[PDB]
């Protein structure tokens, strides 16, 4: 509408949140697994999802996804988390990091292994 309205009130460009706010723009954060559990997604859905309630150093507690194979991971253990969305799951916007401070690499895996926290085979 009118330029006179625009000088009476300028263009209100909108703000948006961090969609992964419990990082406070840290590239990663540390926490402890306040509980750990595994879920079927649905009545016919067989693909178990592995998930943790984890409290961060900043006192937030949040859900995070456990990617790939099993671990030692059990409630007194400590975890590094980073941004990442499990698209099918509700609100799961944090991935745990493979090969982090209390976290094993996927020993078996021969492909993409720098994602999975695992060193070059020793050949």
């Amino acid at each position: 509408a009118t330029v006179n309205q625009l000088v009476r009130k300028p263009r209100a460009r909108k703000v948006a949140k961090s969609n992964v706010p419990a990082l406070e723009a840290c590239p990663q954060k540390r926490g402890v697994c306040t509980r750990v559990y595994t879920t079927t997604p649905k009545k016919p859905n067989s693909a178990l999802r592995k998930v943790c309630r984890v409290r961060l150093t900043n006192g937030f507690e949040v859900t995070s996804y456990i990617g790939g194979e099993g671990h030692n991971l059990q409630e007194h253990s400590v975890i590094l988390i980073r941004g990442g969305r499990v698209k099918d799951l509700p609100g799961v916007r944090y991935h745990t990091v493979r090969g982090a401070l209390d976290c094993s690499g996927v020993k078996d895996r021969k492909q993409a292994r720098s994602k999975y926290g695992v060193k070059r085979p020793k050949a």
Binding site: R35, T38, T39, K43, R55, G70, H71, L73, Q74, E75
Partner: protein
């Protein structure tokens, strides 16, 4: 909240005890999904992997004879760093320890509580609620949690 809680317990007990793990808690929630939550512990330990095992087993062995399957999904869990707890024997392991409780009785001198377990009766939890002490029946409670001190 559960279906046929004893039947469910035994159908779950079969893979739990085949794995040599132990049950702790069974609870169901009704909402956007309707979903069943199993607390298992084993004092050597429960990993994510142990949950993964027993969950894939119950995801078969319950489903094939489900008394109900509405909106269904489930999870199996370690009982948290603040732990849900359900029986006289549970509170009895934890006499002297801080707790929170919510009750089927819902009346002033509020039956929503923060407590330290004073002693256990065969029918009741006796508890240092609000730095006072009082006692609540295992039947007049409905959910409780232990060491809420840990965030």
């Amino acid at each position: 909240m559960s279906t046929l809680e004893q039947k469910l317990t035994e159908m779950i007990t079969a893979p739990v005890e085949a794995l040599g793990f132990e049950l702790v808690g069974i609870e169901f929630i009704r909402g956007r999904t309707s979903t069943l939550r199993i607390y298992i512990d084993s004092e050597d330990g429960i990993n994510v992997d142990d949950c993964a095992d027993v969950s894939h087993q119950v995801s078969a062995v319950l489903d094939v004879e489900d008394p109900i399957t509405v909106a269904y999904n489930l999870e199996v869990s370690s009982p948290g760093l603040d732990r849900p707890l359900f029986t006289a024997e549970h509170y009895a392991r934890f006499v002297g320890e801080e707790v929170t409780l919510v009750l089927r009785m819902a009346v002033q001198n509020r039956r929503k509580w923060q407590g330290v377990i004073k002693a256990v009766d065969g029918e009741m939890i006796t508890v240092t609620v609000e730095g006072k002490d009082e006692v609540f029946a295992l039947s007049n409670i409905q959910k409780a949690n232990l060491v809420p001190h840990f965030a």
